[PDB]
Design a protein around this ligand. Structure first.
Ligand code: 6VK
Length: 347
């Protein structure tokens, strides 16, 4: 049937355009992220996703430039990119295809009034924390961490962060837009108009994802952008004057009734593991600098089961790769390696 041949640069690799042929074309996506097709590569028979976006030459594509740097087992890989079609041009990103997401899988459980087994919550969170450590080590903040942007192969349990359409290199002193992330996952800095925010917003969002996987629903289901704060206050209580300043130095008229935090253990279901709750509490903190780094989150005792030599997937198979760190990934705190790479995994 219908074969399409393009000339396409490999996404990471020397800058060397090659003829690439694909077939079995259909729309699988048309969202926030742009129009996306599934396609099958003629040589390997391998299924890929192709994001096709109108690209003006009067600037460079940010997402392109970000994806070209990334190479990590927990991040969607840009295989190739290519240009196509007025005198109108489309950038085309040829990306890994994965059939599921954490959102879809979680929804399947929740509709059945069920809880995702904690081992899967561990597997998924750990892998998201690694992807975050990795992108953060380049100054890149994703800014759209939510369950929908977590690709998931349901059989191997490998997770890949995708949709870098909101992502951006954060530079100290260059201001950035506040009204960013999906609402339920939006860090309170941002709700407070902060413009000097760091990559620790991704970690707040990661916190929310953890909480959602343990609750079986979003922890902060805001009716509206301002109401999102109200939902936060119902658990963390009101932030202090000093928390407000740490979130946004410009925020002054802070006129509010002081509300007590709800204790963390009563936020979750009766038998939730205490290591999970403790991990949450160190992610969902008003004060941006108080939140764990991704690398530290990875080293948290909540994830100790994954560092057991005898651990297995419930389907009987081996876990995916968890310990193949690079020195880039470890660069924020290289000694963490002694916890993160356990005895059994260096021979
Ligand atoms: C989740 C569904 C059923 C529908 C979808 O939009 C994607 C899928 C399969 N599978 C996908 N595999 N890879 C990709 C994107 C291009 C990298 C997708 C898509 C295009 C995606 C996933 C997550 C966020 C945005 C878009």
């Amino acid at each position: 049937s219908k074969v399409t041949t393009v000339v396409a640069t490999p996404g990471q690799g020397p800058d060397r355009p090659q003829e690439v042929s694909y077939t079995d074309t259909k729309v699988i996506g048309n969202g926030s992220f742009g129009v996306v097709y599934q396609a099958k590569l003629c040589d390997s028979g391998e299924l890929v996703a192709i994001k096709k976006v109108l690209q003006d030459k009067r600037f460079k594509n940010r997402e392109l430039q970000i994806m070209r740097k990334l190479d990590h087992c927990n991040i969607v890989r840009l295989r190739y990119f290519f240009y196509s079609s007025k005198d109108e041009v489309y950038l085309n990103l040829v990306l890994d295809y994965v059939p599921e997401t954490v959102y879809r899988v979680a929804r399947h459980y929740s509709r059945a009034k069920q809880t995702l087994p904690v081992i899967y919550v561990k597997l998924y969170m750990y892998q998201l924390f690694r992807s975050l450590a990795y992108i953060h080590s380049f100054g890149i903040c994703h800014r759209d961490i939510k369950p929908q942007n977590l690709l998931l192969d349901p059989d191997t349990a490998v997770l890949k962060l995708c949709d870098f359409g909101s992502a951006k290199q954060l530079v100290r002193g260059e201001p950035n837009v506040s009204y960013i992330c999906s609402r339920y996952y939006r860090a309170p800095e941002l709700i407070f108009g902060a413009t000097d925010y760091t990559s620790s917003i991704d970690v707040w969002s990661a916190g929310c994802v953890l909480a959602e996987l343990l609750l079986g629903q979003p922890i902060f289901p805001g009716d509206s952008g301002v109401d999102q704060l109200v939902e936060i206050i119902k658990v963390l209580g009101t932030p202090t004057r000093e928390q407000i300043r740490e979130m946004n130095p410009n925020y002054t008229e802070f006129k509010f009734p002081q509300i007590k935090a709800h204790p963390w253990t009563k936020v979750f279901r009766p038998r939730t593991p205490p290591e999970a709750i403790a991990l949450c509490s160190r992610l969902l903190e008003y004060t941006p600098t108080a939140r764990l780094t991704p690398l530290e989150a990875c080293a948290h005792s909540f994830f100790d089961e994954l560092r057991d030599p005898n651990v297995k997937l419930p389907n009987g198979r081996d876990t995916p790769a968890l310990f193949n760190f690079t020195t880039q990934e470890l660069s924020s705190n290289p000694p963490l390696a002694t916890i993160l790479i356990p005895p059994h995994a260096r021979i």
